[PDB]
Amino acid sequence: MTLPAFKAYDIRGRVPDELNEDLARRIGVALAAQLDQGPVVLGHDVRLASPALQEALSAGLRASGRDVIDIGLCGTEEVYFQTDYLKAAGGVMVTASHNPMDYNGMKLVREQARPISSDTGLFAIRDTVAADTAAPGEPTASEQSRTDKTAYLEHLLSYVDRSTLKPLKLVVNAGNGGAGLIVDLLAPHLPFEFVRVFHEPDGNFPNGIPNPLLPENRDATAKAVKDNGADFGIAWDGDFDRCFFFDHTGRFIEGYYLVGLLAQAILAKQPGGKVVHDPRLTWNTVEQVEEAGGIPVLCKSGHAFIKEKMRSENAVYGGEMSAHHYFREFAYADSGMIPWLLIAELVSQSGRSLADLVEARMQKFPCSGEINFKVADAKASVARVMEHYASLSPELDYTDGISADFGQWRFNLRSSNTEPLLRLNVETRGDAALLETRTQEISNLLRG
Ligand SMILES: [Ca+2]
Numbered sequence: 001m002t003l004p005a006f007k008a009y010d011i012r013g014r015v016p017d018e019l020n021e022d023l024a025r026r027i028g029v030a031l032a033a034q035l036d037q038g039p040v041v042l043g044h045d046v047r048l049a050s051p052a053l054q055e056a057l058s059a060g061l062r063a064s065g066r067d068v069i070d071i072g073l074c075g076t077e078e079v080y081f082q083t084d085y086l087k088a089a090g091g092v093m094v095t096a097s098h099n100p101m102d103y104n105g106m107k108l109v110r111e112q113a114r115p116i117s118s119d120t121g122l123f124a125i126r127d128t129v130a131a132d133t134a135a136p137g138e139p140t141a142s143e144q145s146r147t148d149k150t151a152y153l154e155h156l157l158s159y160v161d162r163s164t165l166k167p168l169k170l171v172v173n174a175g176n177g178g179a180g181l182i183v184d185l186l187a188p189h190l191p192f193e194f195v196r197v198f199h200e201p202d203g204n205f206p207n208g209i210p211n212p213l214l215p216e217n218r219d220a221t222a223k224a225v226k227d228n229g230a231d232f233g234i235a236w237d238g239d240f241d242r243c244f245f246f247d248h249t250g251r252f253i254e255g256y257y258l259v260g261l262l263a264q265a266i267l268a269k270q271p272g273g274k275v276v277h278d279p280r281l282t283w284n285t286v287e288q289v290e291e292a293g294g295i296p297v298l299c300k301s302g303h304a305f306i307k308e309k310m311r312s313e314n315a316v317y318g319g320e321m322s323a324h325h326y327f328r329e330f331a332y333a334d335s336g337m338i339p340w341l342l343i344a345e346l347v348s349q350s351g352r353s354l355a356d357l358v359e360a361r362m363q364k365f366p367c368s369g370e371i372n373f374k375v376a377d378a379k380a381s382v383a384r385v386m387e388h389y390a391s392l393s394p395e396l397d398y399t400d401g402i403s404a405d406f407g408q409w410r411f412n413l414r415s416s417n418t419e420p421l422l423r424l425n426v427e428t429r430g431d432a433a434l435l436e437t438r439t440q441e442i443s444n445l446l447r448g
Contacts, residue, residue: 005105006126008118008417009304012096012105015049019104021056023129024094025136027106028060030128031090034121035110038089039067041082043074045095045239046178048203049104054094057106062139072147073201075178076239077335080113081152084331090116098211098237113331117304153185155330160341166348167191168231170340171246173221175210176202177238182337192344197224210238222250231347232354240336242323245343247355256281256367257358258339259319260288265342266317266327267292276310276318276326279400280412280425284365285319300400301414307332321370321425368426368439373446375422378415382422385413385445409438422446 005013005023013019031040040061044050058068066089071082076093083091090110096103108116108125116122170192174180180199187194197220198207208217212235225233225246233246245253263275263285275294277285278301289296299309299318303326306318310332318326325339326332347354375381382402394404401414401423409428415421424442428435 003126003130006118006122009115009122009302010105010107011122012099012103014102015053015104019053021052024053024056024106025060025063026129026132027125028057028062028066029064029132030060030125031057031092031108032061032064032066033128034116034125035066035089038087038111039069041069041071041079041086041088041091043071043076043079043082043091043093045075045093045097046073046176046201046203047096047101047104047238050094050096050203053104053106054092057092057094058143059136059139062141062143063137065141067141068143070143070145070147072145073178073181074149075182075336076107076241077330077333077337078149078152079107080109080331080333081155082146083109083111084113084333085151086146087111093239095239097239098209098242100209101205113333115304115307119304149182149185153182153189156182156186156335156337156341157189159327159329159338160345162190164349165191165345167193168344168347169193169195169228170344171195171197171221171224171228171230171233172199173197173212173217173224173233173235174199174201174240175212175217175235175238176200176205176207177210177236177240179236179240179336182240186337195224195228195230197221210236212237212242212244218252221246222252226250232343234340236336241334243325243336243339244323245340245354247358248353249355251355253354253358254321254362254367254369255323256321257284257361258323258325258343259321260285260361261346261357262319262325262339262342263289263294263317264292265346267294270316273316274313276306276313276315278306278320279397279403280370280414280423281321281365281367281427282403283410283427283429284361287364288361298399303334364430365427366430366432366435368424368435371424371439371443373422373424373443375420375446378420378422381446382413382415385442388445409434411438411442 005018044054079091079093093107397403403412411426
């Protein structure tokens with residue numbers, strides 16, 4: 001009974017069935033009424049339908065008297081950065097992120113790149129749009145093109161001490177998304193030697209959709225690292241707000257361990273700061289943050305929750321195990337570019353490889369990775385797990401799903417709201433055998 005494209009935090013649908021130019025134009029009209037006064041930043045990714053959808057959105061916005069700042073082909077974080085930097089009323093990124101070829105969508109922010117979520121105006125937009133039968137007016141406002149990325153590039157470079165960088169050899173895999181454009185603009189300013197895989201933006205995606213979690217995109221990056229003796233490799237999704245790391249042996253690094261590493265890299269520059277993290281996997285982050293003289297702050301997962309928690313806490317850094325990294329100085333927003341700059345600086349300064357930096361943490365806190373279960377009844381499955389372990393008296397916490405701490409091991413179990421789907425994360429204190437038995441034990445209880 002409601003427009004399916006409108007989800008909890010953004011708009012996502014197949015083109016043109018769930019998302020199309022007419023909906024885009026009506027979203028522009030509706031957005032103009034929810035924002036404070038000021039112009040609106042618009043950007044788009046490499047997908048074939050993205051320019052058209054952005055044009056439709058510009059039309060609806062300008063018909064409603066909003067000036068539009070078109071920043072052209074970009075990553076999502078550039079929309080966040082420019083919205084904040086130009087003191088704009090809001091910003092829209094047109095992007096399908098990592099989704100199949102027939103998909104597109106939008107990420108909406110208001111002033112200072114604050115998220116527009118279902119709680120905070122997205123559903124007011126949905127309702128307005130679903131009720132708008134009126135004819136398209138004419139633009140009574142201007143579209144200015146502002147494709148200069150200089151302020152954004154200078155901001156990125158300010159996170160590192162360039163005199164401390166060594167000439168590392170880095171594999172970069174844009175997946176034919178947008179990240180290669182940024183790498184080429186940064187490269188004149190850095191000592192690194194880049195090895196470019198799937199580099200050119202290409203909305204036909206001849207090498208597969210830009211999703212580095214797909215094993216063939218994983219293997220292309222790992223092979224390039226090994227074949228070229230790179231210090232590490234970096235891959236991004238298509239709008240590059242997510243960054244994934246491969247060490248010099250070609251091993252894919254589970255995102256959990258990057259949270260603690262980036263935290264200690266940041267706390268070295270801004271000592272005593274707060275670090276926000278999500279409850280799925282926690283023990284490594286807490287230890288690394290405290291060892292670096294910081295304070296960890298637990299928060300619900302999901303970018304809307306982490307951003308608002310960082311604002312309220314004046315947190316310097318927040319990280320999710322799912323490759324989302326947020327920085328206070330970047331308008332409390334996520335970037336897929338800052339993380340690898342910080343990692344390259346840490347490797348350069350420490351004389352330790354990325355492999356050695358993480359291997360120590362992996363041995364201390366082995367984790368299962370996120371495991372998904374389609375079940376008949378989420379409530380019954382969860383109850384089966386809780387009843388089975390109740391005699392061990394775990395410490396429970398309900399920040400985000402159920403987290404049960406048993407002393408030597410813990411798990412987090414979250415249920416999707418859109419479907420009967422359970423997501424499981426397990427970790428232990430230095431015990432890989434315990435990790436695997438409990439993971440299989442829970443897997444059995446969840447299934448049967
Ligand atoms: Ca993305």
